Amino acid sequence: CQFDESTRRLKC
Amino acid sequence: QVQLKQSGPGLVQPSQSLSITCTVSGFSLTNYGVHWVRQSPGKGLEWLGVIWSGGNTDYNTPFTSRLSINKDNSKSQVFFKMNSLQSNDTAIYYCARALTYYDYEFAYWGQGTLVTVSAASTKGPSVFPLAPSSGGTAALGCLVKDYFPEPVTVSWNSGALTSGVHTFPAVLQSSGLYSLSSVVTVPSSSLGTQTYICNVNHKPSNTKVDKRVEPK
Amino acid sequence: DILLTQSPVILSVSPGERVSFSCRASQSIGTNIHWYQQRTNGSPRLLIKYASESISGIPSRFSGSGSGTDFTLSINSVESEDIADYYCQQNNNWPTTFGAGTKLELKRTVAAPSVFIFPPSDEQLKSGTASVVCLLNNFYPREAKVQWKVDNALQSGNSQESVTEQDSKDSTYSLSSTLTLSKADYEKHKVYACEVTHQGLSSPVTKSFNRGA
């Protein structure tokens, strides 16, 4: 999983 | 109430410096230290440093050389500055305060400052209507096209409309510019009575647009 | 630096069920561990401090335990508002470090999307670019197919998709598919169709318009 700055959520 | 409010998001060129201001209220910088934390795609959450009540500073080891924290007790401002940024220094940067003056359990956070490291230039977006035209429920929205960098804020009717709002994550186009849509579902019988405005603000470019969305 | 390993990376549970998060440390850190919640476009919210102590204003379904190297955050009856990522933080050794986080997803009943299609606005056509938007609204689960067709010609490579995170109230997703043409191409064609395939529909649903009318 990587953190996503747009949503501030982890995208797996 | 206790709050921390940081300065706006924006673009910093490669090898250039980053500067964020953390303004606090509900407590005094002479009684609590202020910490700085970032959150990046590559390294996740990452403690950067702290300035204590007495003005002393600690910096996480890989940042000792390019980090400097200062403050102004009278004006309740903490100043964050980091030197020579690279691409992997793009992250959400936060200021935060702990529960007790000496500790590290972060009960209060700033709203965050998304920082983009790019030699590209800022560009405001164009705002286009997604005009309505099943079962008495009408869908409408706004197209926020061709801006850089992230982020952009969208609301509806100056904040008074939130139920049924979906604002989609931005997507990076082949041009290198971002794009998103923001939609809302409303009763179709209310399209004759109500006005529907999407409030778009792209702070990196000082672009602020209210777009009225009507049936064609 | 202490390494913090959170397991697993994704948790998928149903409402009212119990759920546990795991945080393991590369060496003993006593009870010097803190937990955080991060909702969509939020900043971290402090849930538990020192493995097990409660935080003012945090609902009682949150609790934590553990000591040494193995720690557990628990939600004894999960709710839709709990959809978020969860991190752990150690502060027994300098510098304080965070784990990589666990994503919490919620299962719910199958919901079919409501499909809407928007032609491009005359305002956008004045810049020589056309955006056709197809909206799939409030559906579960996340997997769905959007197939674009212009004058019965299949479109490939000229559309982009964006999906919301899970809604905190009804646990649904919404999707936008945007088909992007030049203005010249858009004016040369007539029938613009968006076909949607989803588990909640017994047939593909097609929303279309004729340029003009």
Tokens found for residue C72: 């557990």
The amino acid sitting at B64 is T
**Cα angle for residues B194, B200, B201 (degrees, 5° grid):** 145
Q: Which of residues 58-117 of B touch A (CB under 8 A)?
A: 90-92, 112, 114
The amino acid sitting at C135 is L
Nearest Cα to Cα of residue B209 among B159, B139, B142, B160: B142
Cβ pair B50, B35 in contact under 8 A: yes
Q: Which residues pair with C104 in a beta bridge?
A: C11, C84
In chain C, what residues touch A12 (CB-CB under 8 Å)? 9-10, 103
In chain A, what residues touch C103 (CB-CB under 8 Å)? 1, 9-10, 12
CATH architecture type of domain C1-108: Sandwich (2.60)
Which of B64, B98, B118 lies at the terminal end of a domain, its last residue? B118
Domain that holds residue B157: 122-216
Q: Is the minimum CB–CB distance between A5 and chain C shorter than 8 Å? A: no
B143 and B113 in a common domain: no
Helix (H/G/I), strand (E/B), else coil: B61: helix
CATH class given for the domain over C109-213: mainly beta
DSSP string, C47-93: EEETTTEE-TT--TTEEEEEETTEEEEEESS--GGG-EEEEEEE-SS
Q: Is the minimum CB–CB distance between A4 and chain C shorter than 8 Å? A: no
Q: Is the minimum CB–CB distance between B112 and chain C shorter than 8 Å? A: yes
User: Pairing state of beta strands A2-4 and A9-11?
Assistant: antiparallel
User: Pairing state of beta strands C84-90 and C33-38?
Assistant: antiparallel
B186 and B107 in a common domain: no
Alpha-carbon distances, residue C64 vs B41, C36, C57, C119 (angstroms): 27, 11, 16, 51
Within 13 Å of residue B72, how many CA atoms lie on the same side as its CB? 9
PDB experimental method? X-ray
Cα B194 to Cα B26: distance, rounded to the nearest angstrom: 39
Do A12 and C85 lie within an 8 Å CB cutoff? no
DSSP string, B73-136: TTTTEEEEEE-S--GGG-EEEEEEEESSTT---EEEE---EEEEE-SS--BPPEEEEE----TT
Q: What is the DSSP letter of C187?
A: H
Q: Which residues pair with C209 in a beta bridge?
A: C192
Tokens found for residue C146: 């959007």
Cα C125 to Cα B209: distance, rounded to the nearest angstrom: 19
Cβ pair C167, C182 in contact under 8 A: no
Nearest Cα to Cα of residue C143 among C114, C178, C112: C112
Nearest Cα to Cα of residue B109 among B177, B160, B34: B34
**Cα angle for residues C101, C102, C107 (degrees, 5° grid):** 155
Cα B185 to Cα B196: distance, rounded to the nearest angstrom: 11
Cis peptide before B149 (omega within 30 of 0): yes
Do B169 and A6 lie within an 8 Å CB cutoff? yes
Cα B8 to Cα B205: distance, rounded to the nearest angstrom: 11
**Cα angle for residues B35, B41, B43 (degrees, 5° grid):** 60
Residue B71 CA to chain centroid, in angstroms?
A: 22
What's the maximum distance between 2 C-alpha atoms anywhere in chain C?
70
Cα C104 to Cα B169: distance, rounded to the nearest angstrom: 19
Could you tell me where in chain C the CATH 2.60.40.10 domains are found? 1-108, 109-213
Residue B179 CA to chain centroid, in angstroms?
A: 16
Chains touching A (at least 3 CB pairs under 8 A) are B, C
- Go through chain C and tell me how many residues it has: 213
Instruction: Determine phi and psi for C186, rounding to 5 degrees.
Output: -60, -40
B82 and B49 in a common domain: yes
B146 and B184 in a common domain: yes
Do A5 and B114 lie within an 8 Å CB cutoff? yes
Sign of CA dihedral C103, C104, C108, C111: negative
Specify the resolution in Å.
Answer: 2.5
Query: Of C46, C91, C133, which has the smallest distance from its Cβ to B143's Cβ?
Result: C133
B139 and B67 in a common domain: no
Quick count: other Cβ atoms within 10 Å of Cβ C26? 14
Do C162 and B169 lie within an 8 Å CB cutoff? yes
Query: Of C34, C89, C174, which has the smallest distance from its Cβ to B166's Cβ?
Result: C174
Q: What is the DSSP letter of C173?
A: E
Closest residue in C to A5 (Cα) is C41
| Tokens 């590559």 sit on residue | B42
Cα B168 to Cα C176: distance, rounded to the nearest angstrom: 7
Q: What is the rounded end-to-end Cα distance, in angstroms, of chain C?
A: 65
Cβ pair B130, B140 in contact under 8 A: yes
B179 and B145 in a common domain: yes
Closest residue in C to B137 (Cα) is C114
B169 and B76 in a common domain: no
B69 and B87 in a common domain: yes
Residue B23 CA to chain centroid, in angstroms?
A: 15
Do C103 and A7 lie within an 8 Å CB cutoff? no
B99 and B1 in a common domain: yes
Do B39 and A7 lie within an 8 Å CB cutoff? no
B25 and B107 in a common domain: yes
Q: Which residues pair with C19 in a beta bridge?
A: C75
Query: Of C49, C127, C135, which has the smallest distance from its Cβ to B105's Cβ?
Result: C49
Quick count: other Cβ atoms within 10 Å of Cβ C56? 7
Based on the number of CB atoms within 10 Å of its own CB, is C151 exposed (0-12), middle (13-18) or buried (19 or more)? exposed
CATH of the domain at B69: 2.60.40.10
Within 13 Å of residue B125, how many CA atoms lie on the same side as its CB? 32
Query: Total domain count for chain B?
Result: 2
Alpha-carbon distances, residue B128 vs B141, B156, C103, C188 (angstroms): 9, 14, 34, 22
B136 and B171 in a common domain: yes
Cβ pair B94, B78 in contact under 8 A: no
B93 and B109 in a common domain: yes
